[PDB]
Amino acid sequence: SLIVSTQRPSELSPTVLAMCSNWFSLRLTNERDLQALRYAMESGNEQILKQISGLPRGDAVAFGSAFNLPVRISINQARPGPKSSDAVFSEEWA
Amino acid sequence: SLIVSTQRPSELSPTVLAMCSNWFSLRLTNERDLQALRYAMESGNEQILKQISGLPRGDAVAFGSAFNLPVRISINQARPGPKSSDAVFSEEWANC
């Protein structure tokens, strides 16, 4: 199998990009990215691709062989949540 | 008698499609896969391509020389059936 987590699908070949079973997707910003993914879409419709641009954090769109019809899911809370972050920079100058 | 096959007919000559009679197609969801089908056929019918994008499981659309007019077919199961299924991963991960 393959798992590609890209930043700019607008510069990807749709043929290689569109050979998976079921997908997940949070916010995707660039309009060209959405257009390329739309051209690289093999199981879905164009009505749900128009609301990926403004999905808030924690709200995902799922569609595939395990779902009868596409759904907009609000994923549950993070326990334990992410903790990794950069160091506080106030200490460096004093 | 030939069989030309293309699920992406945009990158092919419409003369391949306009000089042929019979076709078979189940549900197919893609907007750019119908340009050759849109152009090749002569004037007289264009509204019958909308429903090819919502056919339920087991339904198919067939049209060609063998049929007087396009018709929607519900195909019966073949007995004995094809292969059972692919691999099941429930048994492999039952080790937990």
Side-chain angles (χ1 to χ4, degrees):
Chain A
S1 292
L2 296 174
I3 299 187
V4 288
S5 312
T6 179
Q7 65 159 354
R8 288 301 200 105
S10 53
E11 303 183 359
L12 293 174
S13 68
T15 311
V16 178
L17 212 63
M19 59 184 178
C20 304
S21 167
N22 53 348
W23 304 350
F24 276 80
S25 181
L26 291 179
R27 194 166 26 207
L28 197 72
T29 314
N30 298 107
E31 293 286 338
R32 288 187 286 113
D33 294 345
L34 301 166
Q35 270 171 28
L37 191 65
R38 183 182 300 113
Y39 197 94
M41 181 269 290
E42 184 178 1
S43 166
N45 50 2
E46 277 66 22
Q47 186 56 253
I48 205 158
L49 267 291
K50 311 310 292 280
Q51 65 182 357
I52 295 174
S53 308
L55 295 167
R57 286 311 291 176
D59 288 17
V61 161
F63 56 91
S65 292
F67 304 93
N68 47 4
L69 78 164
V71 192
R72 185 179 178 181
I73 302 169
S74 172
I75 297 168
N76 280 313
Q77 192 158 18
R79 269 88 168 271
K83 308 174 300 217
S84 310
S85 63
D86 303 344
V88 184
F89 271 22
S90 48
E91 311 158 351
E92 282 213 339
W93 296 346
Chain B
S1 48
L2 313 160
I3 311 282
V4 305
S5 312
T6 177
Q7 59 168 9
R8 288 153 154 87
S10 294
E11 302 180 6
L12 266 173
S13 282
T15 61
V16 178
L17 183 62
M19 197 61 205
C20 288
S21 282
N22 318 324
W23 290 278
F24 264 77
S25 176
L26 290 92
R27 177 207 272 214
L28 208 47
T29 187
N30 216 322
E31 195 53 47
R32 58 101 173 180
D33 295 16
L34 282 65
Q35 287 186 337
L37 289 82
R38 204 173 300 149
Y39 178 48
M41 294 301 169
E42 216 169 350
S43 174
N45 49 356
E46 211 65 31
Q47 202 159 17
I48 323 295
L49 286 174
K50 297 298 295 296
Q51 56 168 348
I52 200 163
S53 179
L55 300 166
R57 173 203 287 262
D59 283 346
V61 168
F63 56 101
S65 60
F67 311 93
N68 204 7
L69 76 166
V71 60
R72 177 163 154 170
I73 299 102
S74 171
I75 290 158
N76 308 143
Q77 189 182 348
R79 292 182 158 288
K83 331 301 159 191
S84 303
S85 172
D86 291 340
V88 181
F89 297 160
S90 74
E91 285 81 2
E92 295 196 3
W93 306 330
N95 293 319
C96 73

